[PDB]
Design an enzyme around this catalytic site. Structure first.
Site, PDB file in Angstrom:
ATOM      1  N   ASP A 179     -12.163   8.687  -8.423  1.00 54.49           N
ATOM      2  CA  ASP A 179     -13.408   9.398  -8.040  1.00 54.49           C
ATOM      3  C   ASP A 179     -13.091  10.731  -7.336  1.00 54.49           C
ATOM      4  O   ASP A 179     -14.050  11.356  -6.862  1.00 54.49           O
ATOM      5  CB  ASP A 179     -14.307   8.510  -7.188  1.00 54.49           C
ATOM      6  CG  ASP A 179     -13.748   8.204  -5.809  1.00 54.49           C
ATOM      7  OD1 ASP A 179     -12.581   8.628  -5.520  1.00 54.49           O
ATOM      8  OD2 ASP A 179     -14.466   7.546  -5.053  1.00 54.49           O
TER       9      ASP A 179
ATOM     10  N   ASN B  66      -8.978   5.614   2.762  1.00 60.71           N
ATOM     11  CA  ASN B  66      -9.660   6.372   1.683  1.00 60.71           C
ATOM     12  C   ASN B  66     -10.548   7.465   2.292  1.00 60.71           C
ATOM     13  O   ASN B  66     -11.422   7.128   3.112  1.00 60.71           O
ATOM     14  CB  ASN B  66     -10.485   5.381   0.852  1.00 60.71           C
ATOM     15  CG  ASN B  66     -10.985   5.969  -0.443  1.00 60.71           C
ATOM     16  OD1 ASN B  66     -10.896   7.171  -0.615  1.00 60.71           O
ATOM     17  ND2 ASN B  66     -11.436   5.125  -1.377  1.00 60.71           N
TER      18      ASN B  66
ATOM     19  N   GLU C 141       0.870  -1.215   0.000  1.00 53.11           N
ATOM     20  CA  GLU C 141       0.000   0.000   0.000  1.00 53.11           C
ATOM     21  C   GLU C 141       0.898   1.254   0.000  1.00 53.11           C
ATOM     22  O   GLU C 141       0.671   2.181  -0.842  1.00 53.11           O
ATOM     23  CB  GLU C 141      -0.973  -0.047   1.183  1.00 53.11           C
ATOM     24  CG  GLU C 141      -2.103  -1.039   1.004  1.00 53.11           C
ATOM     25  CD  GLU C 141      -3.113  -0.704  -0.089  1.00 53.11           C
ATOM     26  OE1 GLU C 141      -3.003   0.394  -0.705  1.00 53.11           O
ATOM     27  OE2 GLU C 141      -3.967  -1.549  -0.340  1.00 53.11           O
TER      28      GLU C 141
ATOM     29  N   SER D 292     -11.400  11.117  -4.467  1.00 53.49           N
ATOM     30  CA  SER D 292     -10.933  10.753  -3.103  1.00 53.49           C
ATOM     31  C   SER D 292      -9.415  10.505  -3.147  1.00 53.49           C
ATOM     32  O   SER D 292      -8.818  10.475  -4.225  1.00 53.49           O
ATOM     33  CB  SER D 292     -11.667   9.557  -2.550  1.00 53.49           C
ATOM     34  OG  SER D 292     -11.377   8.424  -3.337  1.00 53.49           O
TER      35      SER D 292
ATOM     36  N   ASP E 127      -6.230   8.282  -0.896  1.00 53.56           N
ATOM     37  CA  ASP E 127      -5.803   7.293   0.126  1.00 53.56           C
ATOM     38  C   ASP E 127      -4.627   7.877   0.928  1.00 53.56           C
ATOM     39  O   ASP E 127      -3.675   8.361   0.321  1.00 53.56           O
ATOM     40  CB  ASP E 127      -5.417   5.980  -0.552  1.00 53.56           C
ATOM     41  CG  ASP E 127      -6.580   5.159  -1.087  1.00 53.56           C
ATOM     42  OD1 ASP E 127      -7.747   5.591  -0.975  1.00 53.56           O
ATOM     43  OD2 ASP E 127      -6.304   4.048  -1.595  1.00 53.56           O
TER      44      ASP E 127
ATOM     45  N   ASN F  51      -7.399   8.801  -5.910  1.00 54.63           N
ATOM     46  CA  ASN F  51      -8.303   7.797  -6.540  1.00 54.63           C
ATOM     47  C   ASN F  51      -9.026   8.481  -7.709  1.00 54.63           C
ATOM     48  O   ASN F  51      -9.055   9.730  -7.750  1.00 54.63           O
ATOM     49  CB  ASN F  51      -9.283   7.226  -5.528  1.00 54.63           C
ATOM     50  CG  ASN F  51      -8.570   6.579  -4.363  1.00 54.63           C
ATOM     51  OD1 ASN F  51      -7.539   5.945  -4.567  1.00 54.63           O
ATOM     52  ND2 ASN F  51      -9.071   6.799  -3.162  1.00 54.63           N
TER      53      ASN F  51
END
Ligand SMILES: [Au+]
Ligand SMILES: [Au+]
Ligand SMILES: [Au+]
Length: 129
Positions: A48, A59, A35, A50, A52, A46
């Site tokens: 959309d 998120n 990660e 958003s 992380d 991300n």
């Protein structure tokens, strides 16, 4: 902060992640490796809109408020910046809520694609735990 493998294993175990919802410590170290590369400062956008955040890439769509994910949730009731600290407490206590929500560690795309079903005990080999 960029953790050493055994250093993060030790911190995660101290914070009660070893066997949390039946996920061995190796699962958590493997997730953090793929990660964030064990980097508490890691941020990734991300599609959309958003983002992380932190060592476990939590998120803004659901778990924290980053002031730029409009119409999202904040189910860990924290600013996403709390997830970026050298101190993993906030990322751990939020991850426990994520993994408990019915989806288990499948919420972590890197865990699903790179850790799930593998020899995750290899991630704690050599460590004094
Ligand atoms: Au903790
Ligand atoms: Au995880
Ligand atoms: Au810690």
């Amino acid at each position: 902060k960029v953790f050493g493998r055994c250093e993060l294993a030790a911190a995660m175990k101290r914070h009660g992640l070893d066997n949390y919802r039946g996920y061995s410590l190796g699962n958590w170290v493997c997730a953090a490796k793929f990660e964030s590369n064990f980097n508490t400062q890691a941020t990734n956008r991300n599609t959309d809109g958003s983002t992380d955040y932190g060592i476990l890439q939590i998120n803004s769509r659901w778990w924290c408020n980053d002031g730029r994910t409009p119409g999202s949730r904040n189910l860990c009731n924290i600013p996403c910046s709390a997830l970026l600290s050298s101190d993993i407490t906030a990322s751990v206590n939020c991850a426990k809520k994520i993994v408990s929500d019915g989806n288990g560690m499948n919420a972590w795309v890197a865990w699903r694609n790179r850790c799930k079903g593998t020899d995750v005990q290899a991630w704690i080999r050599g460590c004094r735990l």
